Amino acid sequence: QCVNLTTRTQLPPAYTNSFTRGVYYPDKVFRSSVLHSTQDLFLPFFSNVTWFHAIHKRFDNPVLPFNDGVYFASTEKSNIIRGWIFGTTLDSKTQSLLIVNNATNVVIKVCEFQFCNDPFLGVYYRVYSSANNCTFEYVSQPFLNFKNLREFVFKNIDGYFKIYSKHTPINLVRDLPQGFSALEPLVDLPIGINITRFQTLLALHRSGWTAGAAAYYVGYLQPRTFLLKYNENGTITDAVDCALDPLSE
Amino acid sequence: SALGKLQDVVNQNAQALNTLVKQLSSNFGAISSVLNDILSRLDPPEAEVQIDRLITGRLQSLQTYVTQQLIRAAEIRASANLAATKMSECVLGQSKRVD
Amino acid sequence: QIDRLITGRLQSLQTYVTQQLIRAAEIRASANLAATKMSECVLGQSKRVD
Amino acid sequence: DSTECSNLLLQYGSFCTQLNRALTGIAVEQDKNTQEVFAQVKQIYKTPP
Amino acid sequence: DSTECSNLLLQYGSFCTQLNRALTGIAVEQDKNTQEVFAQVKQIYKTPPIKDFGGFNFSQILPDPSKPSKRSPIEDLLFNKVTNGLTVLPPLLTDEMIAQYTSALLAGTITSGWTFGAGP
Amino acid sequence: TKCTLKSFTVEKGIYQTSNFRVQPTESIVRFPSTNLVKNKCVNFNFNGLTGTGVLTESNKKFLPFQQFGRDIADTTDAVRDPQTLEILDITPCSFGGVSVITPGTNTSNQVAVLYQGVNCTEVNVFQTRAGCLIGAEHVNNSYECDIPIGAGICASYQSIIA
Ligand SMILES: *[C@@H]1O[C@H](CO)[C@@H](O[C@@H]2O[C@H](CO)[C@@H](O)[C@H](O)[C@H]2NC(C)=O)[C@H](O)[C@H]1NC(C)=O
Ligand SMILES: *[C@@H]1O[C@H](CO)[C@@H](O[C@@H]2O[C@H](CO)[C@@H](O)[C@H](O)[C@H]2NC(C)=O)[C@H](O)[C@H]1NC(C)=O
Ligand SMILES: *[C@@H]1O[C@H](CO)[C@@H](O)[C@H](O)[C@H]1NC(C)=O
Ligand SMILES: *[C@@H]1O[C@H](CO)[C@@H](O)[C@H](O)[C@H]1NC(C)=O
Ligand SMILES: *[C@@H]1O[C@H](CO)[C@@H](O)[C@H](O)[C@H]1NC(C)=O
Ligand SMILES: *[C@@H]1O[C@H](CO)[C@@H](O)[C@H](O)[C@H]1NC(C)=O
Ligand SMILES: *[C@@H]1O[C@H](CO)[C@@H](O)[C@H](O)[C@H]1NC(C)=O
């Protein structure tokens, strides 16, 4: 089932500063009291990160190019955001990856979904119409004023799709908090398919429809070197972007 | 920065040792920097070529390290000879040499 | 072919740096001697013969 | 300016850093030598007219 | 520990012996340098128990009896202010013996002037 | 020593002759698989990562996703056991130089062996900071240095004393 949503209010997407967010662990190696330089797909410090809102009437669900990697930031309360869609053409011609978290359990599927033009979930107070060739299924634990900061990094390297995640308790009302939080790697997924475009999934509220208050940020990864600092307990506490300014260089 | 002269020597020696150990992680054009990986992954006819590349790269690194150590040892020997001259002429006697 | 060029040029550069360091040591010794002559011959009268 | 040559050069490690560091040490050493030889007085004396 | 690597390495000759010889020469040279600089007297001189030097105070440079390392306050400050086939050989002269040599030189130059450096 | 110096007569002194590379005793393969042993120099195989080292208990608190551990010099010194969720330190197997302390062959043929940087419990046995010295009787008297051993220790012939 698909429904066209025709009650949106036109507004350009916003932009804001990334600050020192988007950092993740480059590998599975514990390091203690050392500084390590890595050349990986990273998000630049103080970069221009795209800002989308869900407020009531704004319901921001565009489809964005994946590029070389994606940083997703979520200033979320009440768990409106439920999952993501990855693929190339988002139809039955190609094979697409679906990540969902409904009210009970987390489902990961790789199928040829016939996606809706406007796919969404609904809570009372519809993502695809068909799935023909399903090659992989994976059921996992629940991943999930704005009260929760959910940071995710998605990469598609060597046919392996890496999901890095971090949850932060925050109390900032509108923008991103300023601080440092390293993203732990969560899921290493063996898909081996082409991904060039993605779309996030929101949840409607029914009492027409109402959009719950949520905000998300999309940033893109570029290949660069970071200098990571490891404390005595092996937790990444600081990082340096070697290409940002001459002092950090 | 009062004791910079000793600290520079300690830092240079530690940095040279650190670089020498870091040179082990370079493959020098071989498939891998680990000998065990080459022994487990390839037959001896190609393994001899891969270990030959690793041996020549590591030997060049070690020769470079030894040459740097010899030059630094010569500099420290000159400094020590100067220090012995100061010990003999300034502490064990009064020196008329200016400065 | 590029590997052969790289190893030859790298060997040449390492050799050049090695003689530069040896000459730097010799010039440093000469400069130390010159500083000693400046301190003892110009800024005072020296009793050292020759 | 060959990218392929630089990519192959990266396999050999930090040789380039070592050579640059050695040359930088020599370059600062020359300035130190000139300071030691000539900069032994902190007052610029002048002759009478 | 690769036997194949050692077998291939033996084809290159006595490079390893040369490098070991050079490092051994440097290692003995460091001990020779310390021996030349600090061991210039063969008599261990000691200061008198009463430090009556005509108003001159040498407490900051003489060894402290209260400290277990038997170092001077200046020497203690100096030691505080300095912070796969690889082995580090210990120096022949320990810090205590080098401190003892400096103490002997200080005692000689305080109680005897320059006479101890030229004879009795 | 005679073979090392290429002479049939050896002068008085300390001469470095060989290396004491402790040999691996067993082979341990761990997968998420034989039994795991500790406090011994063994050939370890942790999830396809092979090597030779002494496996001891570790005080490093690893994060749940991390499996390996590296030092400053990018060498794997810590590992997590796949079968049982525990952390182990890999200390490298004991190694050091083997030096022979002898007087002149004109005087005597007695020798002493110094294992550099090697504890005496895992090799007239005396423990010095330089290493383990076998064949020299330690005395409490102090004399002038005849053959330098290191860390303030010197050896002489009077038997060989240290
Ligand atoms: C919601 O709107 C989209 C876009 O207008 C609809 O997608 C169209 O579907 C028809 C098939 O019935 C195609 O011929 C058009 O080319 C599609 N347009 C685009 C831009 O792809 C979608 O079908 C609508 N949803 C429903 C339930 O009708
Ligand atoms: C020599 O100098 C030392 C330190 O400069 C003097 O020691 C001080 O003595 C006074 C009075 O007893 C104490 O209050 C200070 O704390 C001491 N300082 C230190 C660093 O110990 C010493 O009295 C002087 N005279 C003699 C004869 O030794
Ligand atoms: C971010 O990009 C928008 C247009 O895409 C631009 O108007 C804005 O000034 C940019 N912000 C920064 C900080 O570069
Ligand atoms: C959540 O999705 C899974 C996957 O189809 C489904 O089995 C489960 O019943 C869903 N939860 C609810 C409450 O319907
Ligand atoms: C994918 O599905 C279509 C129709 O459902 C089928 O014709 C096609 O053979 C399938 N491809 C594979 C690789 O299973
Ligand atoms: C992946 O998809 C994009 C867009 O459809 C296409 O340009 C690219 O060639 C694809 N890559 C592969 C390896 O098929
Ligand atoms: C590291 O962990 C210890 C407890 O194991 C804690 O006391 C210490 O504060 C931690 N370090 C940091 C920088 O938080």
Author numbering:
A (entry chain A): 14 to 69, 77 to 145, 158 to 176, 185 to 247, 257 to 298
B (entry chain A): 943 to 1041
C (entry chain B): 992 to 1041
D (entry chain B): 745 to 793
E (entry chain A): 745 to 827, 856 to 892
F (entry chain C): 299 to 330, 530 to 620, 641 to 675, 691 to 694
Q: Please, what does the article write about this entry?
A:
Biolayer interferometry (BLI) analysis of trimeric variant S proteins revealed limited (no change) and moderate (~2-fold) enhancements in ACE2 affinity for the Kappa and Delta variants respectively. To investigate a structural rationale for the observed changes - or lack thereof - in ACE2 binding affinity, we solved the cryo-EM structures of the Kappa and Delta variant spike trimers in complex with ACE2. We found unchanged and moderately increased ACE2 affinities for the Kappa and Delta variant spikes (compared to wild-type S protein) respectively. The combination of these two opposing mutations, one diminishing ACE2 affinity (E484Q), and the other increasing ACE2 binding (L452R), is consistent with the unchanged overall affinity of the Kappa S protein–ACE2 binding interaction. Interestingly, the overall unchanged ACE2 affinity of the Kappa variant S protein stands in contrast to the majority of previously characterised SARS-CoV-2 variants of concern (Alpha, Beta, Gamma). To this second point, we verified that the Kappa S protein dimer-of-trimers complex is labile enough to still permit ACE2 binding through our experimental derivation of the ACE2 bound structure. We saw no evidence of S protein dimer-of-trimer formation in our cryo-EM images upon introducing a modest excess of ACE2 (~1:1.25 S protein trimer : ACE2 molar ratio), despite an identical S protein concentration which resulted in the dimer-of-trimers reconstruction.
The Delta and Kappa variants of SARS-CoV-2 co-emerged in India in late 2020, with the Delta variant underlying the resurgence of COVID-19, even in countries with high vaccination rates. Herein, we report cryo-electron microscopy (cryo-EM) structures of Delta and Kappa variant S protein trimers – both in the unbound state and in complex with the ACE2 receptor – to gain insight into how their mutations underlie changes in ACE2 binding and antibody neutralisation escape. Within the receptor-binding domain (RBD) of the S protein, both the Kappa and Delta variants share an identical substitutional mutation (L452R) with the previously emerged variants of interest B.1.427/429 (Epsilon). Finally, the P681R mutation (present in all B.1.617 lineages) immediately precedes the furin cleavage consensus sequence (682-RRSR/SVA-688), with initial reports suggesting that the P681R mutation enhances cleavage, and consequently S protein post-fusion transition.
